[PDB]
């Protein structure tokens with residue numbers, strides 16, 4: 001078996017497994033020591049049938065990184081684990097409204113008959129919450145390496161939570177040509193120094209955060225639509241920068257451009273971005 005950790009261990013019989021989200025929705029009974037009769041909706045990460053000892057090592061590594069990083073409102077938090085006498089279950093916060101790309105696309109104005117719409121303030125608030133999560137992760141020396149709307153999850157109460165911050169990635173084993181579930185190329189979020197020289201820093205995460213701002217203000221738009229990997233390289237070498245979204249202020253576009261500084265040292269930090277977004281949220285209208 002695996003070494004037990006009574007900080008985190010939840011008995012297997014307290015976890016009611018549900019539908020697939022390998023991640024499944026579950027109900028945890030008595031997740032809190034001081035509340036044994038409460039059911040909490042949670043997300044449970046586990047191994048598939050075909051999983052190797054590498055796959056199991058990777059899942060343990062992610063869980064250990066989460067214990068190490070500790071709790072923040074704007075990240076997907078570890079809640080517990082089932083490690084003894086059965087398959088490994090890593091129990092994390094459940095975000096009922098899915099990833100931020102989906103959440104934004106679902107709330108586009110009619111064109112599509114959505115039940116809800118977002119104000120300008122709501123969009124900036126989203127950006128602020130992600131910046132604050134990233135400021136926390138950077139403070140714990142965590143480099144995300146794939147910060148994108150697809151890796152931000154939205155809770156029932158519309159809280160933004162950074163996901164997949166603990167993930168094991170062999171960066172020398174990346175397939176630049178492999179597309180996401182949704183058919184997009186993750187290379188389109190990578191800083192040039194990460195992409196060409198495989199150097200990942202908090203500064204390359206700020207570059208990704210610039211692409212994430214662009215996703216927010218396009219309500220889940222696809223960066224460089226129709227651009228293959230070889231053409232993206234030529235664009236980045238030429239110093240191409242994506243156009244300003246409509247319904248994006250000059251100030252937020254300059255923030256995106258600052259995140260996209262060719263010189264990593266000249267990008268704003270997440271600490272900087274949190275302060276600036278805090279000010280902009282307060283001055284942004286929720287009336288449209």
Ligand SMILES: Oc1ccc(-c2ccc3c(-c4ccc(N5CC[NH2+]CC5)cc4)n[nH]c3c2)cc1
Nearest residue numbers: 021023043045092093094095096097098163164
């Ligand atoms: O290493 C990982 C750790 C956590 C997760 C993870 C993935 C999905 C969720 C979700 C989640 C919640 C709702 C959905 N929906 C289905 C599709 N859209 C509507 C809502 C999808 C995923 N909540 N919490 C999660 C944690 C994935 C990898």
